[PDB]
């Protein structure tokens, strides 16, 4: 859906003579908290040897974008499952929010790589602070000074079946 970013902090259940287990925190992109907790337990079992029935969720908090009205360049480091193994991938997305950048990446994976949400892992989303560090041409072409471009061949949407005038595509 429309993605939201959460922090999930969990731990093992405290035991006798071994109190205060260490806390672990993950940043999870998900549509709701149920999916976020499911992803957290999945990744915790995949990385550490912690099971959901042996652990507990200490906290889950939504993380809002700090400056949602500022256009930013994002580098997204992801990995996906395959029969050969786990493959890295780096993409660059120009957007005003981390969650919208993640949604764009997921749509791009569904379109090109034929990938799925459960098979795509979001490893890192980092804002590119300097314009010189952007290294994809399809993003660099929008960083040029005094950028202008027209929108030729405009198609207007008619609410009526029949039109009494030949249409124009001017803009």
């Amino acid at each position: 859906a429309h993605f939201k970013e959460y922090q999930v902090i969990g731990r093992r259940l405290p035991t006798e003579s071994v109190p205060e287990p260490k806390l672990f925190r993950m940043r999870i992109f998900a549509s709701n908290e149920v999916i976020a907790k499911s992803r957290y337990w999945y990744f915790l079992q995949k990385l550490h040897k912690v099971k959901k029935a042996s652990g507990e969720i200490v906290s889950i908090n939504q993380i809002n974008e700090a400056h949602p009205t500022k256009v930013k360049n994002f580098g997204v480091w992801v990995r996906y499952d395959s029969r050969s193994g786990t493959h890295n991938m780096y993409k660059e997305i120009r957007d005003v929010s981390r969650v919208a950048a993640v949604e764009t990446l997921y749509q791009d994976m569904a379109a090109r790589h034929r990938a799925r949400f459960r098979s795509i892992h979001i490893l890192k989303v980092a804002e590119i602070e300097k314009t010189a560090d952007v290294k994809r041409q399809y993003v660099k072409q929008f960083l040029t000074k005094d950028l202008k471009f027209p929108l030729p061949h405009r198609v207007q949407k008619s609410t009526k079946t029949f039109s009494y005038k030949r249409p124009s595509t001017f803009y």
Partner: protein, 114 residues
Amino acid sequence: KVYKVGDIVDIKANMPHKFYQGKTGVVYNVTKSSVGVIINKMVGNRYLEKRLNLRVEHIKHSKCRQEFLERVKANAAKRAEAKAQGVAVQLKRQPAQPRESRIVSTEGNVPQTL
């Protein structure tokens, strides 16, 4: 290790009839060599009684009623104590309950992002 008729035993091998691994039965025949075990097996929609003959080393005493006997003794002791001193006593077993609330402090245990 002496087995008598009516004992509850577990069938545990130290090739044929591999279906009878982990089965629990009642001793009905005891010889100087082998032991006879009654097994109730599911056939269709009914249970049938079958006689199995086993070596002594391939069976052992089953402890499936040990918890029942110990719980009966503990219940008798607690009932005697609560009859001696008037108090409301709960004797039935209860399933595991959902846990209550708690406070988890980050006092030296600052959460670490993985």
